[PDB]
Amino acid sequence: QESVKEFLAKAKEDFLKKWETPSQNTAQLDQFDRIKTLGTGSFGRVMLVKHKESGNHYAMKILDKQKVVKLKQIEHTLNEKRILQAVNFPFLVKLEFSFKDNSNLYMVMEYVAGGEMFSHLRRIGRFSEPHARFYAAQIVLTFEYLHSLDLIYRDLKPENLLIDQQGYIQVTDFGFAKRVKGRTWTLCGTPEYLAPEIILSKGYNKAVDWWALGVLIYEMAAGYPPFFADQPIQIYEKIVSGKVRFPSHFSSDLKDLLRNLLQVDLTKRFGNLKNGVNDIKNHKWFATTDWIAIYQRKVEAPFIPKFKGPGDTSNFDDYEEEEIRVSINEKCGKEFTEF
């Protein structure tokens, strides 16, 4: 399959050029005006900022260096920046600038005004199978690209996907993403999307992302995730069992694709077999999907986010606005020398 092979060949060489010699210190905090908080995480937050000279809107992720060190995840924040800086694909959020100061780490990404997929899925209840397929096709191609680069994106979920102005996906939250040739062992991700391997503390690979896609597609088409419970311990038992129930409204094609994606045995899971990503691309649920037109973004989107100018924050929710504290002394300069 030549058109895809030469494509993925130019993609790994373009990626490694950036991976082996990363960009550092391409902007400063005082070249931006702070507007509004768009989201929060363990060690920081994402904020809508405006570049003072060009007038462009950007999403600035601010991470506190000492909070990272305290709960040892230095490697994860270093992974996040180096990968983001090195990739380039139409369904991935673009990292425009990066820098650090005495207290924080900063990643200045593109501002995607359409907001998180979570908001729109919850508002609509559930997506139709054509609508869910449109999104799923994009994740399939995004992972085909990322897995080619020996990258595992370990956190697929509706909150981690943004919908842009053309209704297409922009994957964000590369916080758990890692470059690895083979297996990895870190217990990370989100409870209801975790594959059996991770729960059972095994050395897992890219197959973990294809399980997560099964969960994502079940959630988009049903409105809720396949494995739910009050306590994480009870979610995990349900995942490790080889049992999953499907809503009656699900098509037979969808139920069959999901059984092979939500295969508890990782050696039998789609995306991780001999035929690779093609066991999914050639599955009957994707029969109507024109893969090159999805990539070239020629397909009409089943939903366009309602917003005004590029800098509108209506689709993002409100969070407490706190101070951006930058200490007069440099903290943990040694641990973040590579950022």
Ligand SMILES: O=C(NC1CNCCCC1OC(=O)c1ccc(C(=O)c2ccccc2O)cc1)c1ccc(O)cc1
């Ligand atoms: O990524 C964006 N925002 C999101 C959408 N996903 C939902 C969670 C909140 C969030 O990202 C964060 O706010 C966030 C995430 C993680 C961490 C974090 O501390 C962290 C923890 C472990 C590993 C890496 C990390 O960065 C901090 C902030 C985002 C990016 C671009 C954009 O235009 C608009 C939004």
